[PDB]
Amino acid sequence: ALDKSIVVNLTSRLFADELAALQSKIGSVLPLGDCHRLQNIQALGLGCVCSRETSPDYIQIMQYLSKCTLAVLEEVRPDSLRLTRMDPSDNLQIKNVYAPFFQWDSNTQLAVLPPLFSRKDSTIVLESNGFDIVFPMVVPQQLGHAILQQLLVYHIYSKISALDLYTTNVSFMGRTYRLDVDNTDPRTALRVLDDLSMYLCILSALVPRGCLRLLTALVRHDRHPLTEVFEGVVPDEVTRIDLDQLSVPDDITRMRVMFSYLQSLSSIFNLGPRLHVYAYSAETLAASCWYSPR
Amino acid sequence: HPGFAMTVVRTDEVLAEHILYCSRASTSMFVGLPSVVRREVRSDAVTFEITHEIASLHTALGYSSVIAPAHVAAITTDMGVHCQDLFMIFPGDAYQDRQLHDYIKMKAGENLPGLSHGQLATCEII
Amino acid sequence: ATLEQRPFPYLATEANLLTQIKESAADGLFKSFQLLLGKDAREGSVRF
Amino acid sequence: FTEYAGAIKTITSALQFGMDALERGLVDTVLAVKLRHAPPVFILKTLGD
Amino acid sequence: EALLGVYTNVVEFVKFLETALAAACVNTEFKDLRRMIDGKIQFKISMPT
Amino acid sequence: QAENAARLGRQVLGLLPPPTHRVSLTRGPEFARGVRDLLSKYAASTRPTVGSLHEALRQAPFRQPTYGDFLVYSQTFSPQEPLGTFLFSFKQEDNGSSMDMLLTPTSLFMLSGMEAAKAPQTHKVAGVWYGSGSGLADFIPNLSELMDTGEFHTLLTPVGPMVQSVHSTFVTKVTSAMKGVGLARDEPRAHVGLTLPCDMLVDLDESCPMREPAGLNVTIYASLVYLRVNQRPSMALTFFQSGKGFAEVVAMIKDHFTDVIRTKYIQLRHELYINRLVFGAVCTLGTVPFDSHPVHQSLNSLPVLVFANFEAACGPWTVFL
Amino acid sequence: PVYSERGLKKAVKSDMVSMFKAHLIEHSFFLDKAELMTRGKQYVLTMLS
Amino acid sequence: PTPVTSDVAYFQTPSNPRGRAACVVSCDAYSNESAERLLYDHSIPDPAY
Amino acid sequence: NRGLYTLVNEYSARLAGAPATSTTDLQYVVVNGTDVFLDQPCHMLQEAY
Hints:
The structure is cut from a larger assembly and holds 1 copy of chain A, 7 copies of chain B and 1 copy of chain F. Chain A contains 8 helices and 14 strands. By secondary structure, chain A is an alpha+beta fold. Chain B is extended. Chains in contact: A-B, A-F, B-D, B-E, B-F, B-G, B-H, B-I, C-D, C-E, C-G, D-E, D-F, D-I, G-H, G-I. Chain G: This is ORF25.
């Protein structure tokens, strides 16, 4: 069968300082450029798209991430980095040392994200060779989605300012977090938002009338736990659309096209490659998972 | 003549053949064993890989090898009188009138399809 | 006078034939060549 | 038989290639080790005195 | 029409040990170099006055 | 004549699925001796030989496609093809036992009815394989109405490249390939690659560079675009080739079809029909390995690409706009 | 092959045509240029080797 | 015929009497659209000066 | 600024800051140091000829 291993040649002996950080994160996922055994250090970083002096754009970095082949480390020798590889469709041991710590279990789900909480904590610099290395973050899909939800909401409401507690905070059961935005290039994050303005005003044209009349019967008295968004008051717009008579075969043709455009929103809310964990050990922090590029 | 004079700085490249002398027994060499690694197996072909590992250590403390320029083979840089366009390095900076900035850019300036004398060389102005 | 890749029993020469072949074939030193990369570089099969 | 035996001549000559392109790897890297530790004459001559 | 000649190169390998470059070096075959992490050579220089 | 029958004793027993790894515990540690294909680093010598490495060449991966068997009217499937074309299976209703309808991309050009300059080369070639276009359109009387509501992408299932066509007078048998590289029938030891017309294919990774990562995977995508020409509904099918991930290519396909989106939707300031809103759909026709060079060919000319090591993996149609 | 080791680019061909001109003027009719030199035999012999 | 203000220092170095150089060996192979910008286009300086 | 024995060492093994490309139409700066063999003796001496 197949071999997969990448040993990274390197032109200077590393110091004991940076050897201690790389020894601490010995099981870690990071992308790299080319699919070969021997490799320069300038491909191993995610820092070829996320630099210090250039303003990073986290969507473009994430857009960059689904192109690259991914890799897991095996050893850190004082000269050479030795890594193993991730290919479809192979079962592999994965071991999270990822610093904003979350808990996994057996039969969980994962996805790879750029560093979005602490760049200084997740990037170590190599002064010996001058090139810095950026580690990505692996997140379960629920917070994997909910960070990209808050990041798209941010770039809408930074443009309107042309304050922070509603825009830059990712919410979750038990914890709240801070997204890292000081210098972001919004332009690659806005062509995503330009295509959202395409889908969302088409979805406002084919709204079913029976589902709007269902809310005018619902939110006025029938209060439910998950309808507290409207706070007990109907919007002014929903009363204006339901003036027509309801007819069933009109909404049959509407709810098919409502169904088919919600197939398209997969393409604009995509994460990177996904990781299907089938067995996860708790006290050892390792796992087992098969890699699927989509 | 405007109010100022100016100096000009170039570069030059010379294809040079070299004599490398190396004294005896200056590096100790360590030679491992080759192996064969099979990977990237496809339906038309199967790719292999033969790898080898070497350790090299410097035996003595003084310098034990000396290179030297010996023979000029060519001049590539053409010693041209082309000067560098600061419009290319700094495209963001521009004049306040966007109608006057497109005038001065007209009066000064992949454009070359062929060059006769040699590889063209940028100058400066101090 | 046609080129063909039939599996001839090629004979061996002492003299080298490798000096300036990367930039002579690309710039057209001699007509009627064919470059073979990788798995193509083989004496394939016989079919009469 | 002449299809088999002409395909075993392919795979050896594809593998004599593999070893004899690695003996060039010695001669490359040993010469590249020397050039990293070879300062020129004009620097080293006055230091030699 | 005729075949008149069917000719082909033969690449003769040149060993590093039979190059005269190896007179600038000291060669030892070392069976397990992948096991080694680091090498070291230590000097003791006395200086009389 | 048993010498002829002992050949099948050799070749069938040599060509089987690898059996399940099951060793009784009373034998001891003999099962570890039966793990040979997981071992992936083989020893080399000073002068390695085939006799040294005939064990390393012996262990091979287990690869096999899953063919499809189609029985086609000989009016639709033109009797001469370049043996590697891509296929589709249009499906409306089971009327008989097994009579199947297959659509090559040159046949689906003729049912479309688009203008000549949209695909200037295949219009000449698809007009000599077929008539004026009504030799095929009599099977689908709903070509005017499937294009209005936009159901035509839901009725095609991408199948894969040809392997063999045994042609008779009234009925043509067609064996295609799913799930991977189909074995060539007439040439032994060979692999049928997928052949596309150069006119239909639209490359997507092309730069000056003016740097992008390499990988293991580049995926051929199909697309099918609902439009209107001469105030008549008609379709347009193109191909795409990029390894950029599905999140970019949907944004890269919309930039290609920017003009066609605008010239359609100038109409619906006047008439807003919700059936008309569906525009395109994108499938995934399977992967190509990275850095395999598509080899140009020409047939009668018709320039036709070909892809080595194409392995097929069909996907659904997702409606982009 | 010291000139075409990079491949004949657009700037190598210009450096190479600029040596077609310079040898056509300086070293031409060499057995007539060496009737009036001081070296003589040493110039023809390095021209004809 | 030539303007009376043309340089004498053009007539010492051996180039053609067109006023622009006509070397086409310098430019790219089989690109007829690119070799015409040398001869007749005046957006660029001539390759001599 | 450092002692001159380190400047003899770093002179050969380290391609210094802001070099120039070779063989390409204009003087570009080379970022791909896998191939380029240039030695520039103007940084140690700090002159211009």
